[PDB]
């Protein structure tokens, strides 16, 4: 018997009216399938939402431990296990996901085998085990039959383009996703619906359509109860505000921090966001990571030192950075910083140039702002955001 | 029984040494399969290049009439008919292509059925019978098995993006094509190789990598004997030169006109190219179409009138145009022209704005040049090109 059923029975003896509270929370028409779930091994709810919502409602603090246990006892050939694969991925529960994938790739059920292989491609692409060219090649060769995996094959690519800064294929790819084709699995349909709204929000951020960006993140938030999509919606909203409204940006980053502080990753993500925000607005910065030697944290150190005319301190950090291999995006920042330190238009021009190479219509504001202050034509600077 | 075999036998009796002349031209090791082709109904060459090259060599002036007849008597289930479908499409022989497609969709051979359906999607997308979203949907649903149709499904989309001005997804899509996977049909492999070189040349034009552009068009020309790919290679080379070298641009357009003047479409394409060139360099313009009411020709009329300070005449043409529904690209031109007529910086800014909306890194030079002349910062104007 799974930890979730043990905990639900122990809590059912102390409080007998939890039966109809859980049946409503699970979205069921009567307590019937919930009864089945408690007294017969392997009886799974028609929709995976049912158990998720119960766990979130009743054991919010224990979600990972309980869901891990439940998921890893699931018959890998059922609809519930397929739902579990999505649930693990959505939540970034990698150890659950990888076990599920591994049994699914070589099982007798054809539908489970397909989800298995598609999610494997996603995992491999995320970790740089394979190139994008090999991923798409392998996806073609699967002859994908379910509309679920048909959507996920696009989403998986969308994630990869987003994290490598390769924005241009995104707008066209997302328009091809059609979730209305997914009819058997409502958990997957809705989770994917959330995935799409956050992805849309991000695309809009990159094209500098800031209101639309926020409109899409709000749709994301209203569509989900998964921490991960909430984290990234708050992050995107905050970013969409980074240059225009300090207070509202800060509020969004702190909101995100507050729901996610428990998790080291999410914590760091909001720490970095707050750090950026505070350097952009030239405030005192309690969020600088003095212990990291990554390029991002060092640039923030520099940016801060420069903001406060701590010029010698800036130079040391800039010296440390000139020894590190920069990509196009990181070089754009480098030139921005150099430009600020030496008050040199040429550096801002190079900054613009590299932001343009890396297709960044966001951070490019930094060198554009400096040029404005130096009296360059505001009309031209605005067109450079286009 | 086909007109091509009748004409080849009649020409073989009057001149007996045509046997080894045609065998070399067909690329065969000896006259053997050529003998078979002439004296047994339905014997088709191993590679479709063989009959094409013969026809081009021997009946250049009658290629369409003869190839039409030959193609439409072909067993729709053979490799030669599949080759014929490519040959008709490459050449824009639409009446041959549509008949071939239509019999191929519902024949017993699996491979022919697949090429049939893919090319149908291409035809329908080219004519706006279906949307891009429906094309890709329908292609997924075909479960494409051959590497030939796997390449064509990308090429077909590439064509659509190119003709609708939707450049951003192109770079990523073309990188996914791998023609080295096509082993069974050398005609299709090589024709596609030409398709890819021209498409590459065009992508490079749009990204303003002008040397590479030309390098790709030259590869195109050296790889083909199809008029269509020659036309578009000369057009692209000329366009890559439109702003930098008048003489060499003109030479390329005139070369293209000379090999293609017989065909109404190609004629008009070079007429428009020459027209643009000559307005850009502010010469007398032999190529203005005073009889057309399309937006493109009217803008060229205006551009010319403006070049020669015929300001009232310009204004009438501009008035006529404001009554027609404009695209983003057409509006960009409109503002450019308006800008030149009233020497008004605001119009050039709007021009830049709409070129930016339509992802045009080419014609955008026009309003940029005016701003230079009006003394705006050259560094900033350069960055506006990317």
Author numbering:
A (entry chain A), B (entry chain B): 1 to 386
From the paper:
Bacillus phages use a communication system, termed “arbitrium,” to coordinate lysis-lysogeny decisions. Arbitrium communication is mediated by the production and secretion of a hexapeptide (AimP) during lytic cycle. Once internalized, AimP reduces the expression of the negative regulator of lysogeny, AimX, by binding to the transcription factor, AimR, promoting lysogeny. We have elucidated the crystal structures of AimR from the Bacillus subtilis SPbeta phage in its apo form, bound to its DNA operator and in complex with AimP.
To establish the molecular basis of this novel mechanism of phage communication we produced crystals of AimR in its apo form that diffracted to 2.7Å and belong to space group P21 with eight monomers in the asymmetric unit. The overall structure of each monomer shows an N-terminal HTH DNA-binding domain (residues 1–59) directly connected (only 2 residues) to a C-terminal regulatory domain (residues 62–386) composed of 18 helices arranged in a two-layered right-handed superhelix. The HTH motif includes 4 helices (helix α1–α4), and the predicted DNA recognition helix α3 is solvent exposed, which is compatible with the active DNA-binding state proposed for the apo protein (Erez et al., 2017). Sequence analysis with TPRpred server (Zimmermann et al., 2018) only predicts the presence of four TPR, but the structure showed that the 18 α helices of C-terminal domain could be organized in 9 TPR-like motifs if helix α4 of the HTH domain was part of the first TPR. Interactions at the two ends of the TPR superhelix mediate AimR dimerization. The constant region of dimerization is nucleated by the interaction of the C-terminal α22 helices in TPR9, generating a helix bundle where also participate helices α20 from TPR8 that form a four-helix bundle. Although these two TPRs are involved in all the AimR apo dimer interactions, the specific contact changes among dimers, indicating that this region works through a slipping interface of contact.
